[PDB]
């Protein structure tokens, strides 16, 4: 009984690689070339910030484009002012361990999570003067991955067994729960328009999950090792996936196949951290041999280097508008770009 | 001398700075101990002796509070989170010390030190614990000693060649994991052999972590 | 969420006298504190200040060394002293803590005050109408003018523009640039041209009509332009 499940199996297999094979007309390089290239493009710190005693994990932008969260090894979640150096307050979390932080887009809440399989989300503006964990979820056995909130209300998680779950911030109860990637899941990134999502596992697997009808709209494949992070285009319809095996690439949602792969023979470590810019046309990455490569979409070539860290590369991010970029790794400091 | 609004949002990073660097001298007088081997075969009843996700276990002795992170339940991809503990002062693997005398296997007709050598040899290679040195822990050391006298050790190995007496035999199956070692030069192992009505169970290795400490300052003013 | 205030009665000059504050139920380890004296025709005027961790005081135009503000959270010990009191005192004040972020709410909130009797370069900014007769059923547009530029170079202009309702203690409408206040109605609104300031009420009720105060201050020294009381 199982030799003929085992066949239709491959069959169906087969029949879709078929259908995308049939797909490709030509690839990316030739149609975005015959175009003038960015150059050498770099720019000093125009600021530099302090105060972390161990090595960042996560941080995240804000919606006024100017206020900025972030997360280290030592239980602290510390708000930045970027304009001018100031610390506007610190949350003590429960746990030191933690990978997760995120930024409300009303910015009344934050969240942070870690190795507990928890999601603790503490309120911001607080009438009485303070920053008080909101709400605390806990529904996996494991450890989170990525986190991205979709509205003031509805949260998307990303577990480290196989699975991701929509929650609702009144009742801990999941809302919907998708389940695949047979394997472990390592990063999470939410569509700007807040009606679609991806992640990337530790089996070379990408898959689109519906928010409202909660299934695998698509699988994607690619890559031979694991899969660390990732992060939609501006647009809404692309994404680009940063593996350990040295080497980035582009998906499109609607294409379903390869379109560009970045790596570069000097380098032979893996990807830490990938994000975008405004217009979707610089590609920065952040890796683990202490640079934090900046190359265009369209033309892998390298454009810029923000060397300057005394260790491996963790956090990215951009402004809103696509004013300045932050930065951070393993050294305590946290730069920001511009 | 800026603004009004400035003036006072400049006293906010005074504050931050003195939090911060009040807390963060805080948790730099403590030991942190990984024990990435297997913990639940015998070392939770040495937790119980001292005193899902990460266990944190905090205990103290000779002015040293030492932070415990026992990983047992985390069941997921070992090489994806071993990073974070990389700093450790030390890691203590454990054995339970009964499995050739009890021939208990069930690992699919294999012995369970087969399994734990290979677990060895995977975490004393590692790139992340190169200048960390383990500290083994020997349990059950009374059940194997009233129970290997029936035991045919060369069964289950043919490469031992000794006779039956408990203070020789083990003594041979030390080099196999012992040698698998490739960094003689820091990776120090240590063995205790530690019994379960065994009172000072601990002490032995807040010694090892002073001989770790003292031989690291060493390395920062440069004696060695 | 509340204050309680002790001091009042009579007093005679040159008597010393603290006036203390309490923010039980409410954290306060971080709130500056304004101190705000009442002039029954004029508008208030701010009369002392503190900052976070009591490392910066402040003083209005003709208060220095007269007034000395001590804070102590530890034993909820919160409160001013009085240095060489003068028989020209016979005043109510309010007592406003507030911390300054970024897109903080400054002046959000406010204290309940109390009375207090004694025996008998500053910008200066002028209200378009003073003591108007109150008219139930008609829309409130009141103007203002500044001294000088209100725009500072960090682009955070210094727009009050606070409201008293008749009772006990007044609100905010505009803090900075437009923008409404918390616990208030919709119906208050705020705007702003160049030197000209405006104050708007289109829906009107029971507590709709009240008493309307400016500020716009770059420097130290806060005080209110000429009392707009309607119900004068």
């Known amino acids: 009984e199982l030799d003929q499940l085992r066949q239709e199996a491959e069959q169906l297999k087969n029949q879709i690689r078929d259908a995308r094979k049939a797909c490709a007309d030509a690839t990316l390089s030739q149609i975005t070339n015959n175009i003038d290239p960015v150059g050498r493009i770099q720019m000093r710190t125009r600021r530099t910030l302090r105060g972390h005693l161990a090595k960042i994990y996560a941080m995240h932008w804000g919606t006024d484009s100017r206020l900025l969260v972030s997360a280290s090894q030592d239980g602290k979640l510390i708000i930045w002012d970027s304009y001018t150096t100031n610390k506007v307050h610190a949350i003590p979390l429960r746990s030191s361990w933690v990978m997760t932080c995120a930024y409300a887009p009303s910015g009344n809440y934050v969240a942070c999570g870690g190795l507990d399989n928890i999601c603790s989300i503490y309120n911001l503006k607080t009438r009485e003067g303070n920053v008080r964990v909101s709400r605390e979820l806990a529904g996996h056995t494991g450890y989170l991955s990525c986190c991205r909130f979709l509205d003031d209300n509805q949260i998307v998680t990303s577990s480290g067994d196989t699975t991701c779950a929509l929650w609702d911030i009144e009742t801990g109860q999941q809302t919907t729960t998708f389940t695949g990637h047979t394997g472990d899941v390592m990063s999470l990134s939410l569509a700007p328009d807040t009606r679609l999502f991806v992640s990337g596992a530790c089996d070379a697997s990408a898959k689109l999950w519906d928010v409202r009808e909660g299934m695998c709209r698509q699988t994607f494949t690619g890559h031979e090792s694991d899969i660390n992070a990732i992060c939609f285009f501006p647009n809404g319809n692309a994404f680009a996936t940063g593996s350990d095996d040295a080497t980035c690439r582009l998906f499109d949602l609607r294409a379903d196949q390869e379109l560009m792969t970045y790596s570069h023979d000097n380098i032979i470590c893996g990807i830490t951290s990938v994000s975008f810019s405004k217009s979707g046309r610089l590609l920065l990455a952040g890796y683990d041999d202490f640079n934090c490569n900046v190359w265009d979409a369209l033309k892998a070539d390298r454009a810029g280097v923000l060397a300057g860290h005394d260790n491996r590369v963790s956090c990215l991010g951009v402004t809103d508008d696509g004013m300045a970029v932050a930065t951070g790794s393993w050294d305590s400091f946290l730069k920001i770009w511009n | 001398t800026v603004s009004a609004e400035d003036k006072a949002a400049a006293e906010r990073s005074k504050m931050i700075d003195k939090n911060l660097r009040e807390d963060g001298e805080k948790a730099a007088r403590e030991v942190k101990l990984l024990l990435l081997g297997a913990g639940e075969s015998g070392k939770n009843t040495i937790v119980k002796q001292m005193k899902t996700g990460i266990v944190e276990t905090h205990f103290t002795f000779k002015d040293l509070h030492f932070k415990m992170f026992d990983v047992g339940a985390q069941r997921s991809e070992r090489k994806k989170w071993i990073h974070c503990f990389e700093g450790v002062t030390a890691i203590i693997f454990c054995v339970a010390l009964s499995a050739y005398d009890l021939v208990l296997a069930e690992d699919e007709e294999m012995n369970r030190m087969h399994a734990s050598m290979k677990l060895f040899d995977s975490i004393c290679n590692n790139k992340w614990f190169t200048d960390t040195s383990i500290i083994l822990f020997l349990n059950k050391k009374d059940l194997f000693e009233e129970k290997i006298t029936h035991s045919p050790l060369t069964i289950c190995f043919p490469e031992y060649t000794g006779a039956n007496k408990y203070d020789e035999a083990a003594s041979y199956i030390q080099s196999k994991f012992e040698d698998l070692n490739k960094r003689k030069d820091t990776k120090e192992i240590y063995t205790h052999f530690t019994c379960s009505t065994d009172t000072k169970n601990v002490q032995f290795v807040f010694d090892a972590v002073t001989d770790v400490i003292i031989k690291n300052n060493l390395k920062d003013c440069g004696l060695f | 969420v509340q204050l309680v205030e002790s001091g009042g009665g009579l007093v005679q000059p040159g008597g010393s006298r603290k006036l203390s504050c309490s923010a039980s139920?409410?954290?306060?380890?971080?709130?500056?504190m304004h101190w705000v004296r009442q002039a029954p025709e004029k508008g208030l005027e701010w009369v002392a200040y503190?900052?976070?961790?009591?490392?910066?005081?402040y003083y209005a135009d003709t208060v220095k060394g007269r007034f000395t503000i001590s804070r102590d959270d530890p034993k909820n010990t919160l409160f001013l002293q009085m240095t060489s009191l003068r028989s020209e005192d016979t005043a109510m004040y309010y007592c406003?803590?507030?911390?300054?972020?970024?897109?903080?709410?400054?002046?959000?909130?406010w204290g309940q005050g109390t009375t207090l009797t004694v025996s008998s370069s500053d910008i200066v900014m002028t209200q378009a109408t003073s003591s108007v007769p109150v008219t139930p059923g008609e829309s409130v547009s009141i103007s203002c003018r500044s001294s000088?530029?209100?725009?500072?170079?960090?682009?955070?202009?210094?727009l009050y523009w606070f409201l008293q309702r008749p009772g006990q203690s007044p609100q905010l409408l505009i803090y900075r640039m437009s923008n409404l206040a918390s616990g208030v109605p919709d119906r208050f609104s705020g705007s702003g041209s160049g030197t000209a300031f405006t104050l708007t009420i289109s829906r009107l009720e029971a507590e709709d009509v009240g008493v309307y105060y400016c500020?716009?201050?770059?420097?130290?020294?806060?005080?209110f332009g000429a009392g707009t009381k309607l119900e004068l």
């Open positions: 139920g409410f954290a306060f380890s971080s709130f500056g």
């Open positions: 000088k530029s209100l725009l500072h170079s960090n682009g955070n202009t210094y």
């Open positions: 503190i900052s976070s961790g009591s490392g910066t005081i």
């Open positions: 500020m716009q201050h770059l420097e130290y020294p806060l005080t």
């Open positions: 406003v803590r507030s911390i300054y972020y970024y897109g903080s709410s400054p002046f959000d909130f």
